[PDB]
Amino acid sequence: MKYFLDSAILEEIRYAYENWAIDGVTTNPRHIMNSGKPFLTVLDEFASEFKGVENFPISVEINPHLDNAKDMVEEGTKIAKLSSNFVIKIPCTEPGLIAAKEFEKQGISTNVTLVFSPSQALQPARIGAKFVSPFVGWKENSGDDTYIQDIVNIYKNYNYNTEIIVAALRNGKQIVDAAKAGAHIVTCGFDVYKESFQHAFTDYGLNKFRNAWDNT
Amino acid sequence: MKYFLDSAILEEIRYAYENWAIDGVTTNPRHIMNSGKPFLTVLDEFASEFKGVENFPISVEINPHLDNAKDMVEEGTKIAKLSSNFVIKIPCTEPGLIAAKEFEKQGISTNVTLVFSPSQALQPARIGAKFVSPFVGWKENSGDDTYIQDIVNIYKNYNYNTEIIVAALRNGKQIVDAAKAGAHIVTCGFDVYKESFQHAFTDYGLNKFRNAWDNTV
Amino acid sequence: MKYFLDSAILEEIRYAYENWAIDGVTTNPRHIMNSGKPFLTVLDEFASEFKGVENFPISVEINPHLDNAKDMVEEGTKIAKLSSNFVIKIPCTEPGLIAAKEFEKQGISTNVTLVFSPSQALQPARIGAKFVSPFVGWKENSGDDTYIQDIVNIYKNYNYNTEIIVAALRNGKQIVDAAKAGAHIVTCGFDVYKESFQHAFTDYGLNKFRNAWDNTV
Amino acid sequence: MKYFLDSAILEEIRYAYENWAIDGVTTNPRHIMNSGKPFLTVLDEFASEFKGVENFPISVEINPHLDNAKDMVEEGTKIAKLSSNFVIKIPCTEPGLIAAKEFEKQGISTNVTLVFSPSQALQPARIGAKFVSPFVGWKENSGDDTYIQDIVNIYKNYNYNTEIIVAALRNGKQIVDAAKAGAHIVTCGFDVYKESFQHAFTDYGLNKFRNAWDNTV
Amino acid sequence: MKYFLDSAILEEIRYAYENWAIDGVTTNPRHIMNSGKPFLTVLDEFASEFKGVENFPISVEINPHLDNAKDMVEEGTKIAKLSSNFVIKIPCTEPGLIAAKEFEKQGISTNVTLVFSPSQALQPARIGAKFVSPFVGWKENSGDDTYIQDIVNIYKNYNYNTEIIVAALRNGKQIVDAAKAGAHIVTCGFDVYKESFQHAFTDYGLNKFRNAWDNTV
Amino acid sequence: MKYFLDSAILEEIRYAYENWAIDGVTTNPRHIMNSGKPFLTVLDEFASEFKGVENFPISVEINPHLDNAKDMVEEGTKIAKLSSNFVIKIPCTEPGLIAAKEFEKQGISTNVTLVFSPSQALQPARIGAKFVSPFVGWKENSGDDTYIQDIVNIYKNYNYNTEIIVAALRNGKQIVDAAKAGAHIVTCGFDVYKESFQHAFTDYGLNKFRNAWDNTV
Amino acid sequence: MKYFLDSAILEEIRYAYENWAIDGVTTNPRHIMNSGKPFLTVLDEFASEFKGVENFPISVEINPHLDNAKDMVEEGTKIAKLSSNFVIKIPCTEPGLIAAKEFEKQGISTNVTLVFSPSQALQPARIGAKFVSPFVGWKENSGDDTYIQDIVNIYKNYNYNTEIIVAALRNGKQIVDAAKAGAHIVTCGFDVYKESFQHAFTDYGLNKFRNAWDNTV
Amino acid sequence: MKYFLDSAILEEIRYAYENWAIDGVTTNPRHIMNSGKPFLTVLDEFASEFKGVENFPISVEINPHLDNAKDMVEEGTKIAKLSSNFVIKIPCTEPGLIAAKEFEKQGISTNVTLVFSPSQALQPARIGAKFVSPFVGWKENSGDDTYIQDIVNIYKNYNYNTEIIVAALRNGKQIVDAAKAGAHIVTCGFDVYKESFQHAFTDYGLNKFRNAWDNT
Ligand SMILES: *[C@H](CO)[C@H](O)[C@H](O)[C@@H](O)CS(=O)(=O)O
Ligand SMILES: *[C@H](CO)[C@H](O)[C@H](O)[C@@H](O)CS(=O)(=O)O
Ligand SMILES: *[C@H](CO)[C@H](O)[C@H](O)[C@@H](O)CS(=O)(=O)O
Ligand SMILES: *[C@H](CO)[C@H](O)[C@H](O)[C@@H](O)CS(=O)(=O)O
Ligand SMILES: *[C@H](CO)[C@H](O)[C@H](O)[C@@H](O)CS(=O)(=O)O
Ligand SMILES: *[C@H](CO)[C@H](O)[C@H](O)[C@@H](O)CS(=O)(=O)O
Ligand SMILES: *[C@H](CO)[C@H](O)[C@H](O)[C@@H](O)CS(=O)(=O)O
């Protein structure tokens, strides 16, 4: 099970890598906006921070305004030529799935993102996408139950190599649901991961044990 | 199905009451801290705005440092005397369940809060608490699945009048889980309720119908 | 179980009303564009074809562009001064649910449409909407399974009077899915209803029974 | 639970009525062909045999070649006047469901037959058919499986008075499937009913009990 | 739940009636053979033992060689005159179901026995049999799983008054399956009932409680 | 839902009765060996403590060495004459069930205890025992899963008035299992009830709410 | 299936080894406040008793007041240098999981204890902890159902080598629940293991077999 | 699937071995009492009857009045030294499980009997007992449902070579419940096996075939 930090801040990407053993980092245009730094700056820092680090995927979304599968394959190329750890993140559109097939044919790893159905997720796997990111949190905010088990089961039944990155996770019970399903990776913010490692009954027992130690 | 606004901001309680038909405002020491106003001030403004309004439960938690059921029955009696809409919120502890049984015997409505198991929910029901608030969000943040259906089923099987207020709700899917269980009330923040009323397919269809209207005479 | 004809063509509305006993009619801006007639005319013709009839709800949607609950209240009030049978169809949005609550308070029947979750469907129920239309076909076209049973169960558990109109139905196993759930009404196009009444095994048996009748005096 | 004899032979109808307490008789153009007597003759005999008998429905299918409603309502209005026990059996076709609605409006009991889906069985109920005959054996000869629980559940959920007659039954285990579903009536041939009343373990026990009786005084 | 003693021994019938509150007694040609007394004597000691006792049914099987519904309604009528507590037990044969319908029409209570399927049992209920005895033990001895829940559910769904007597019971686990199904009566031998009232964890606790009582003033 | 205190200590019975609203008290021959006081001294303190209190059943087990239903019926009559609030507790054995039937016929309330099977629980209710105590903890200690739902269902199904007292409970999750089943009463020690009312997540929230209160003016 | 003795009393550790074949020993700061001997003494005894007994893990918890992962790694390195059988037990806290990752990198076996959620048992195995101890008893005492199957199923899927030690077990039914889930090890007190090996039906059969042996030559 | 004859009568053991292919024989102090012969006599006959027969286990229970693991590993050793087909049957008690662990260490096959829970069955497995006999008919005679499925499934999640000889079986329906679970052996008396091979619909068909054979 891989834990990808869904953040674009280096302080938290350095902490999680040295203390939590994160296996990768996913970013979206909103995480880079919240960074406060320009996009190219965030990329330069991420490229140097993990220059040598191998097997550390860094998903980076291309211009969200791109509408042609050809202006995507030419922008996500400039980007993929900035760091070998960079994985071009492309939305679940028709120009995106056409651009993700061309990218994968040229050997550029792609993460087909914004997938909200098991039918929007099968095509990315039939064009050899390295990663497919099915979103959970967004659908739930609108009162929809979150198809993740279906994608895991389909991927397995047809021996697909595409790795599923359950995204928009907001709590550790959703990490346990992704993991109960068999999802390959789970991407979550720094705080979702910290709270997932904590429990009130650990603090209760700690107080009971801290007492028995002080009475010995 | 009651929708209670979990907030201590009046401008939001004003809107939600005039547009969403909120059935009551729950609050906790953290919501009053985030209000930026002193506790007694928040109470006065809520005791005035909803002065005549009948059947608008306003749950207000007493001092969380109170450790004796006697110090509780005395602090919550004072708060309850400030408006008839106010429902004293007491934590599910020994000194809270003893204090909730007294208040309920004196006719002061009580909301036994911080309940995280169906065993902690049954005692509040056996002492005639008006409300019992089982929390969901907190347990989930620690990787625990959220016992709500058990409480609803137990309450129903034993004909208890205590109304269940599923609390710590963070999304509309958790509001749909509480409704599918049969919970009486669901307390959520203003933004959880707004997003629960919205869907992407409702913007998709409204673009398809907005274009059809433009190609019509 | 009510069968509403999802059509704006009076020629198919007239056939279904006499031969299939349809219980009502629903029209979206796209059906009134496919009619080929202007809207205010498709209206005049329904306002006259059913002037005598009552309990035959005719759902009709307002400018899919209106963004304010006030401008939505003014437009749907006028469209309702056209015929007692006219039920104003409003999208499940922020200003649509605010406009549907004001409409229902003035006694104008409303059909909160474009609902794609049980959470967007509970608020329409809370404000006393006459009808709530949960869409099925659109979600399926995008690979999503179609929450209809949840809405039926929630509506029933909380004794809501709002009648559920399963919409975007494309076949008769989807009409059988809505009936198995307990949905009140199902809205479908004329051809979905005709094919739902037919089966190949009925034509097989008919041929076997035709052969027997012939080999008999 | 009603047991209708699916036969046009009056030696089997007379036996089953006096010994098995059959509650009715269903016939199809193939049962009348196998009778060896002309259709009108079989009808005259059935009309006299049960002249006074009340509550004994005798389902009789009209010409299977009839393709128009107007021509169906005319051949069964004339088959109905030959006995008050006769129930016009009409195929689940467009012209058949239109003819079954006109018939039911004139007070002529109708049995909409050849129904092989729950979507085809709902319309007969939405037009007040006295009986709807969902078919089992035919669909299973072709490998398919038997919806005969969906129809029962739908009929019940919507309080329909139409009585379901599970037809094409070939064994008592299918009589037990229809009874477990809640079907109102089951129509079966004389031999299906006889074998359904018999078991090998009844003959085994009978031999064990016949042995003891002989080793007693 | 009623408990009928499946025995023809009056020392066991007398004990079970005074200590276990048995509600009736069922006998078969094999129980009378094992009695060691003549059938007539066993039938004249049961008549006197319960002369006045009301609501104490005593099921008595007629000659198992009877093959005609007539010679069996003549021999059975005879036994039914020798006491008002006697219920004629008739096998689930064709001549038996015809004879059980005639008897039930003359007001003689009948117990249609040797029923090994829910179809062999729906007919006894459609003719108004007072009791239907579905056998369990015999089918199990041959490796067949024991349809009892189906009969209970069918009887209930169609509001039948026939009372189900689960027979051939051999252990208390089978008495709890009949009860978990909703069977009206369970017939068992004296030893099956005694052991069903005992456990080894009741003897364990008794020893723990006897040790405590001793170590106490 | 009744909470009986499984204790013979009057400091815990008096606290539970005044703060937790216990509805009754159950005692076993070993909880008395533990009280330190002699048996009839324990009883006489219970009789005075609850002389006025009506409807507070106090289950008291008779001599566990009693082997005859006559000796048991002679000794439980004496104990029952020492208070109306006393309910004679009898083991589920042959002579205990015979003694419990005689006791119930004389109007002395009985609690048939040491029941470990759903089959041992049936004769108890088939003789009108006031209470039946199915034990859970003992069976679990030996690796056996704990039949309680079966007893609740069998009791409901055959509409029996005997009240089920789930006994040997050791944790609040077993109290939530009994409540989810529909058991009438649950008997537990003082500490099982205290811990059942407490949760670590209530102490967590209390600390979060105590920090917020301190930053509020 | 490994059975670790949750004890710090060497009379019980020595017995369980020589007679029950325990596969290891787990201890906590409260088991050592109960062993009387000071901590370092208990450790010296455990180190000598198992000086050359390979594959006998002895889990020993470090100072529970340690709040820094650096202070925990210094204290647990010292304890681990006292024996090769010793396994440093660290709480599932932020600094505990950081200290357990450093320990496992230096080759010191660690047992991440106090895990109550399956999201907490995931960082532990995503850092190569030798053991993860999910607690059951504590959660149950507060009325919470005990996620153990989820952890087992998550470890198998992702193929984590970390061995799960279900802790706080209190009966043999909870040992049978852990075994049915597929847990690697179960840690229990000496008395939980003794009672788990005993059953009242083994004493019943033993008495039946002892009576037979006596009535035999 | 092994069918052991739960009998101490050699006329029934001889018949079942030659006609039903029984794979073994289990006996208890009550079966030897009902034999009418002295215990040592029954043993001598069983030892000679199957002197050469290999892979024919004969479970023989020792004094039920023994409470010391030392007098039980001393009374078994003597019996086990009478025939190599003999398997010492020991009750699931503290001293029985201690005595079964000593026997199994000395290479004497043991059948830990009187097991009525899956917890009481796991210890016999953890000490290498050849056989474990979970009883069914005694628990059901008192109204308890019969765990035999979780003894089979735990003995499989943990690869235990102990073989489950499910005992106290009284009808063919339990010989089929045990088979549907995955029990290795099932012990039943001569007649629970005879009746299990017979059905009324085999006599019904035989009369149809028999009649259709006088019409041909
Ligand atoms: C990339 C998917 O692989 C992104 O990081 C994703 O947008 C979301 O995970 C997060 S959020 O909604 O923006 O929080
Ligand atoms: C009262 C319960 O009835 C409170 O408003 C409650 O604390 C929580 O609902 C919310 S949060 O965790 O503080 O968001
Ligand atoms: C109104 C809902 O009550 C409409 O008629 C609805 O849009 C859809 O039912 C149909 S479609 O997708 O336009 O076919
Ligand atoms: C009428 C239905 O109510 C008929 O009798 C029906 O065709 C079938 O039941 C029988 S068969 O296939 O012709 O045997
Ligand atoms: C009557 C049925 O009501 C009989 O008593 C029945 O045969 C069987 O219950 C018993 S047995 O197989 O003969 O034991
Ligand atoms: C009476 C049953 O109603 C007793 O109080 C019972 O023995 C047990 O509940 C408790 S324990 O095992 O002795 O703890
Ligand atoms: C270590 C976990 O591996 C301990 O021994 C644990 O605390 C608990 O198992 C037991 S108790 O609650 O202290 O009884």
- Nearest CA to D50 out of D76, D3, D78, D86 is that of D86
E7, amino acid identity: S
The 3-state DSSP class for residue C25 equals strand
A75 contacts A88 by C-beta, under 8 angstroms: no
C-alpha of B24 from chain center: 8
| CA R_g for chain F | 19
E171:H143 CB<8 A = yes
- Nearest CA to A185 out of A211, A212, A148, A213 is that of A148
Spatial strand order of the sheet with B131-134 comes to: B25-26, B2-6, B185-188, B163-166, B131-134, B110-115, B86-91, B58-61
Find, in chain F, the residue whose alpha carbon is nearest to that of B124: F197
The 3-state DSSP class for residue H37 equals coil
- Residues of G with Cβ-Cβ distance to E204 under 8 angstroms: 200, 203
Q: What are the residue boundaries of the structural domains of chain H, listed by start? A: 2-212
E215 Cβ under 8 Å from any chain F Cβ? yes
Q: Give the residue before each break in chain C, using a C-to-N cut-off of over 2.5 angstroms; say none if it is continuous.
A: 146
F191 contacts F8 by C-beta, under 8 angstroms: no
Atom of ligand 5 nearest to the CA of E189: 14
- Nearest CA to B109 out of B56, B151, B59 is that of B59
The Cα–Cα gap between B27 and C172 comes to 49
Cα E127 to middle of ligand 4, angstroms: 25
Catalytic residue chosen out of the listed positions B51, B78, B89, B173 = B89
Residues in contact with A96: Cβ distance below 8 Å, sequence separation at least 6, in sequence order: A69, A72, A90, A112
Burial of C61 (0-12, 13-18, 19+ CB in 10 A): buried
The Cα–Cα gap between A109 and G14 comes to 59
Find, in chain F, the residue whose alpha carbon is nearest to that of H147: F144
For chain A, list the contacting chains (3+ Cβ pairs, <8 Å): B, C, F, G
Point out the residue among G1, G182, G210 whose CB comes nearest to the CB of H126: G1
Cβ of B111 below 6 Å from ligand 2: yes
The Cα–Cα gap between F146 and F138 comes to 10
**Interior/surface letters G17-55, b for 16+ CB within 10 angstroms, e for the rest:** bebbebbbbbbbbbbbbebeeebeebbeebeebbeeeee
A103 contacts A73 by C-beta, under 8 angstroms: yes
Separation of first and last alpha carbons in chain H: 40
Main-chain dihedrals φ then ψ at residue F89, nearest 5 degrees: -95, 120
The Cα–Cα gap between D10 and D15 comes to 8
E44 contacts E82 by C-beta, under 8 angstroms: yes
How close, in Å, is residue B176 to chain G by CA atoms?
23
Assigned token pair, A50: 């993990």
- Residues of E with Cβ-Cβ distance to H171 under 8 angstroms: 137, 140-141, 143, 170
Main-chain dihedrals φ then ψ at residue F51, nearest 5 degrees: -85, -40
Residues in contact with H165: Cβ distance below 8 Å, sequence separation at least 6, in sequence order: H2, H4, H26, H59, H111, H131, H132, H133, H183, H184, H185, H186, H187
G192, amino acid identity: V
Q: Which residue pairs, CB below 8 angstroms and at least 24 apart, start in D88-91? A: D88/D60, D88/D62, D89/D26, D89/D27, D89/D28, D89/D59, D89/D60, D89/D61, D89/D62, D89/D113, D89/D133, D90/D61, D90/D62, D91/C202, D91/C205, D91/C206, D91/C209, D91/D61, D91/D64
The Cα–Cα gap between B66 and B59 comes to 17
- Residues of E with Cβ-Cβ distance to G204 under 8 angstroms: 200, 203
**Distance of CA G122 to CAs A1, C104, H42, Å?**
9, 52, 60
| Nearest protein CA to atom 8 of ligand 5, as residue | E168
**Distance of CA E205 to CAs E51, F92, F113, F139, F145, Å?**
43, 11, 10, 11, 18
The Cα–Cα gap between G79 and G108 comes to 10
Assigned token pair, C199: 């089966």
B205:C114 CB<8 A = yes
Find, in chain A, the residue whose alpha carbon is nearest to that of C145: A147
Q: Where are the alpha helices (DSSP H) in C26-171?
A: 31-34, 39-49, 69-78, 94-105, 118-126, 137-141, 148-157
Cα G7 to middle of ligand 7, angstroms: 9
How many CA atoms within 13 Å lie on the side-chain side of G68?
Answer: 4
| Nearest protein CA to atom 11 of ligand 3, as residue | C168
Residues in contact with D173: Cβ distance below 8 Å, sequence separation at least 6, in sequence order: E119
Atom of ligand 3 nearest to the CA of C27: 5
B156 Cβ under 8 Å from any chain C Cβ? no
Assigned token pair, H170: 């009284």
- Residues of H with Cβ-Cβ distance to D200 under 8 angstroms: 199-201, 203-204
With vertex at residue E137, the alpha carbon angle to CA E136 and CA E143, rounded to the nearest 5 degrees, is: 95
Burial of D45 (0-12, 13-18, 19+ CB in 10 A): middle
Point out the residue among A143, A174, A195 whose CB comes nearest to the CB of B175: A143
- Regarding the domain delimited by A2-214, which CATH topology (the fold level of the hierarchy) does it fall under? TIM Barrel (3.20.20)
Find, in chain B, the residue whose alpha carbon is nearest to that of C121: B197
- Nearest CA to C139 out of A142, B201, A91 is that of B201
Best residue in E63, E89, E123 to probe D by mutation, most D CBs within 10 Å? E123
Ligand nearest to the CA of E212: 6
| Nearest protein CA to atom 10 of ligand 1, as residue | A168
H203:D201 CB<8 A = no
Cβ of E113 below 6 Å from ligand 5: yes
Pairs of residues, one from chain E and one from chain H, whose beta carbons lie less than 8 Å apart: 59
F145 Cβ under 8 Å from any chain H Cβ? yes
Q: How many residues does chain G have?
A: 217
E88 contacts E110 by C-beta, under 8 angstroms: yes
G122 Cβ under 8 Å from any chain A Cβ? yes
* Pairing verdict, β D2-6 and C86-91: unpaired
DSSP one-letter string for D101-152? HHHHHTT--EEEEEE-SHHHHHHHHTTT-SEEEEB-HHHHHTT----TTHHH
G145 Cβ under 8 Å from any chain F Cβ? yes
Main-chain dihedrals φ then ψ at residue G115, nearest 5 degrees: -105, 125
- Residues of B with Cβ-Cβ distance to G120 under 8 angstroms: 142-143
The 3-state DSSP class for residue C111 equals strand
The Cα–Cα gap between D189 and D4 comes to 9
Q: Is B touching H (3+ C-beta pairs, cut-off 8 A)?
A: no
- Nearest CA to B90 out of B126, B129, B39 is that of B129
B16 contacts B26 by C-beta, under 8 angstroms: no
Q: How many residues does chain C have?
A: 217
Residues in contact with F40: Cβ distance below 8 Å, sequence separation at least 6, in sequence order: F82
The 3-state DSSP class for residue A184 equals coil
Tell the residue number behind the tokens 């995503």, with chain if given. G126
Point out the residue among C61, C92, C101 whose CB comes nearest to the CB of B202: C92
Separation of first and last alpha carbons in chain G: 43
E5 contacts E25 by C-beta, under 8 angstroms: yes
G114:A182 CB<8 A = no
Main-chain dihedrals φ then ψ at residue A174, nearest 5 degrees: -80, -30
| Nearest protein CA to atom 5 of ligand 5, as residue | E27
E43, amino acid identity: L
Cα D6 to middle of ligand 4, angstroms: 6
Main-chain dihedrals φ then ψ at residue D149, nearest 5 degrees: -110, -35
DSSP C162: P
The Cα–Cα gap between A120 and A111 comes to 13
| Nearest protein CA to atom 10 of ligand 7, as residue | G168
Tell the residue number behind the tokens 């806290």, with chain if given. G93
- The partner residues of E24 in beta bridges, in order of sequence, read E4
Separation of first and last alpha carbons in chain B: 42
**Interior/surface letters C116-142, b for 16+ CB within 10 angstroms, e for the rest:** bbbbbbbbbbbbbbbbbbbbbbbbbee
Cβ of F110 below 6 Å from ligand 6: no
Cα G88 to middle of ligand 7, angstroms: 14
The 3-state DSSP class for residue A3 equals strand
**Distance of CA F22 to CAs B118, D99, F55, Å?**
18, 70, 11
With vertex at residue D50, the alpha carbon angle to CA D49 and CA D51, rounded to the nearest 5 degrees, is: 100
- Residues of D with Cβ-Cβ distance to C173 under 8 angstroms: 117, 119
DSSP one-letter string for B28-39? -HHHHHHH-S-H
The Cα–Cα gap between H93 and G200 comes to 11
| CA R_g for chain D | 19
Q: Is H89 a catalytic residue?
A: yes
- Positive or negative CA dihedral for F15, F19, F20, F24? positive
The Cα–Cα gap between B46 and B49 comes to 5
A35 contacts A8 by C-beta, under 8 angstroms: yes
Cα A189 to middle of ligand 1, angstroms: 9
Cβ of B113 below 6 Å from ligand 2: yes
F32 Cβ under 8 Å from any chain E Cβ? yes
The Cα–Cα gap between A51 and D14 comes to 95
Cα F181 to middle of ligand 6, angstroms: 20
- Positive or negative CA dihedral for C125, C129, C133, C139? negative
Cα C103 to middle of ligand 7, angstroms: 63
Residues in contact with E212: Cβ distance below 8 Å, sequence separation at least 6, in sequence order: F28, F29, F30, F32, F33, F64
The Cα–Cα gap between E201 and F140 comes to 12
Residues in contact with F20: Cβ distance below 8 Å, sequence separation at least 6, in sequence order: B97, B123, F3, F193
- Nearest CA to G1 out of H108, H94, H128, H117 is that of H128
Sequence-ordered strand ranges (E) for chain A: 2-6, 24-26, 58-61, 86-90, 110-115, 131-134, 163-166, 185-188
Find, in chain H, the residue whose alpha carbon is nearest to that of G17: H98
The Cα–Cα gap between G111 and G26 comes to 10
CATH of domain F2-215: 3.20.20.70
- Nearest CA to A136 out of A17, A6, A34, A2 is that of A6
C82 contacts C47 by C-beta, under 8 angstroms: yes
3-state helix, strand, coil in chain D (%, to 5): 50, 20, 35
Residue D44 CB coordination number (10 Å): 14
The Cα–Cα gap between E143 and H173 comes to 4
Cα C75 to middle of ligand 4, angstroms: 57
- Positive or negative CA dihedral for C40, C41, C43, C47? positive
- Nearest CA to A213 out of G95, G40, G63 is that of G63
Residue F100's H or E segment, with its range, is: helix F94-105
The 3-state DSSP class for residue B93 equals coil
Burial of E193 (0-12, 13-18, 19+ CB in 10 A): buried
Assigned token pair, C28: 């979206």
| Nearest protein CA to atom 14 of ligand 6, as residue | F168
Which of A3, A7, A133, A171 gets mutated to test ligand 1 (max ligand atoms within 8 A of its CB)? A133
For chain H, list the contacting chains (3+ Cβ pairs, <8 Å): D, E, F, G
Tell the residue number behind the tokens 């201590």, with chain if given. B8
The 3-state DSSP class for residue A84 equals coil
Residues in contact with C167: Cβ distance below 8 Å, sequence separation at least 6, in sequence order: C6, C26, C113, C133, C134, C135, C136, C137, C187
C30:B199 CB<8 A = no
The Cα–Cα gap between B181 and B149 comes to 5
The Cα–Cα gap between E79 and E1 comes to 27
Residues in contact with E59: Cβ distance below 8 Å, sequence separation at least 6, in sequence order: E4, E24, E25, E26, E27, E87, E89, E111, E113, E131, E133, E165
Burial of G90 (0-12, 13-18, 19+ CB in 10 A): buried
Find, in chain H, the residue whose alpha carbon is nearest to that of E144: H173
Q: Where are the alpha helices (DSSP H) in chain E?
A: 10-15, 29-35, 39-49, 71-81, 94-106, 118-126, 137-141, 148-157, 172-181, 190-196, 201-214
**Looking at domain H2-212, what is its CATH homologous superfamily?**
Aldolase class I (3.20.20.70)
G143 Cβ under 8 Å from any chain B Cβ? yes
**Distance of CA H93 to CAs A136, F162, H100, H110, Å?**
54, 37, 10, 14
